[PDB]
Every structure is written in C-alpha cells, then in structure tokens.
C-alpha cells in the first residue's frame, strides 16, 4: 500500500487536543515515537493549561492505529497506513455509562516526518460528583479489544468497542466507544474484513516533572484472521 512505507521505522509523533469538559476549558500537548513493526507506543502528554481536569486515563484512545502492528497475512487489511501519508479524520463519541458523554474529531496525518494527530474534544453532562468529575479512576489501564468493520459508505471503517476503567473503590466504570474514519484523501484505501486489535497499556508519571502530565507505553497487534 501506499502508507505501508512510511511505518518502516520509529516515528516521531506529536499529539495536540483541545477540549472543554463542562464548561472546563484545557489543552493538552503530547509528543513520542511509534514503532509499528513491534506496535509499539512511547509518549509523554503535557498538560498545558494547567491542571486537567479529568483523569487522564479517560483520554488514552483519545490521544493513532496506524501504529498498530499487523501480522503479514493481514497486511492488506491495514485501513489505517494505507490513509497515509495524507491522513483520516477519526471521530467518535464516548458514552461514559451512568455519566456524561465526550464527543471528538480529530485529523491524523503526516506534517513532514512527523505523524500529527491533532484533536477537539467537546464532554458534556457529566456529573459534578461523578467518576469523571470527581476524579475516582486509579491510574493504571487494561487490555481490550477494538472491533473493526468496513464502511464501504462513506470508504472508510467502523469502530466500536468498550473500556474498563478501573474505580478507587474496587469498582468498574464503563466507557462505550463508537468510531468512524474516513480518509482525508481522494486516493485508494484499503477496506478490510472483520477483524480487531489487541491492545495493552502502562501508565507512569515522570519523577523529574512537575507539571501535570501522563506517561504512556502501549502495544497493540492485529487479529482475527
């Protein structure tokens, strides 16, 4: 394909996202590698505007698939490289069970070497005494399974899957995820079978930095076929 290319080795990767949480304005600036032939992650998110205020783990899939590794029997169904190098818009919405919903639109694209994904972020109705607002998520991540479909329609993919989000009390706070992508440009794509993604992921903080931020270290493989 046409991206394929491109993911021939690290990098480097720039991550943008304004959003507005009920009226709680913040901005967040993000910046790492990907390493696709081993679907690996590394970034490092800053938050900009000062405190954020959600929990961060509530914007890990918010904060590029096309890092994801895809075994060689399933190459030509990697939607997301063959959008490449100019990009897709990746837009979803996020229904966070008994709690207010995020809705985004973001552009994923190269800017020279550089792969930029760059994102608006729009939550509304969250409750002031929530998970989310009331900041009760611990700081750590599961492993899940995003489920892919083509959408011939609008020559692009379906996504749609749900995160586990652990609660401080022991407890589990859903977030259903529901995705569409369409590429950005006129070029081919490759449209795939049914298929999904593995994914795995580690938060930390960094010792040494003092403004509010997230570490992040994730791998995701291909499967199903």
Same mark, same amino acid.
């Given at each position: 394909?046409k991206?394929?290319? @491109?993911? =021939?080795?690290? &990098?480097?990767?720039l991550?943008e996202?304004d959003?507005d949480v009920?009226? $709680?304005? !913040?901005?967040? %600036?993000?910046?790492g590698?990907?390493?696709?032939?081993?679907?690996?992650?590394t970034?490092?998110?800053?938050?900009?505007?000062?405190?954020l205020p959600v929990?961060?783990?509530? @914007?890990? =899939?918010?904060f &590029?698939?096309?890092?994801?590794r895809y075994?060689?029997?399933?190459?030509r $169904?990697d !939607?997301?490289? %063959?959008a490449?190098?100019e990009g897709?818009?990746?837009?979803?919405?996020i229904?966070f069970?008994?709690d207010?919903?995020?809705?985004?639109?973001a552009?994923?694209k190269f800017?020279g070497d =550089?792969?930029?994904?760059?994102?608006?972020?729009?939550?509304?109705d969250?409750?002031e005494?929530g998970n989310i607002?009331?900041?009760?998520?611990?700081?750590?991540?599961?492993?899940?399974?995003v489920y892919i479909?083509?959408?011939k329609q609008?020559?692009?993919?379906?996504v749609?899957?749900?995160?586990?989000?652990n609660?401080?009390?022991?407890?589990?706070?859903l977030?259903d995820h529901?995705?569409?992508?369409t590429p950005?440009?006129?070029?081919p794509?490759?449209?795939?079978?049914?298929?999904?993604?593995?994914?795995?992921?580690?938060?930390?903080?960094?010792?040494?930095?003092?403004?509010?931020?997230?570490?992040?270290?994730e791998?995701?493989?291909?499967?199903?076929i």
């Open positions: 394909s991206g394929e290319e @491109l993911f =021939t080795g690290v &990098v480097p990767i991550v996202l959003g009920n009226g $709680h304005k !913040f901005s967040v %600036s993000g910046e590698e990907g390493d696709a032939t081993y679907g690996k992650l970034l490092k998110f800053i938050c900009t505007t000062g405190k929990p961060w783990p509530t @914007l890990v =899939t918010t &590029v698939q096309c890092f994801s075994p060689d029997h399933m190459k $169904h !939607f997301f490289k %063959s490449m190098p897709y818009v990746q837009e979803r919405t229904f069970k008994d207010g919903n995020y809705k985004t639109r552009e994923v800017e =550089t792969l930029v994904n760059r994102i608006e972020l729009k939550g509304i969250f409750k005494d607002l009331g900041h009760k998520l611990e700081y750590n991540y599961n492993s899940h399974n479909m083509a959408d609008k020559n692009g993919i379906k749609n899957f749900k995160i586990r989000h609660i401080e009390d022991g407890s589990v706070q977030a529901y995705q569409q992508n950005i440009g006129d070029g794509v490759l449209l795939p079978d049914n298929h999904y993604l593995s994914t795995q992921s580690a938060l930390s903080k960094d010792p040494n930095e003092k403004r509010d931020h997230m570490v992040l270290l791998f995701v493989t291909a499967a199903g």
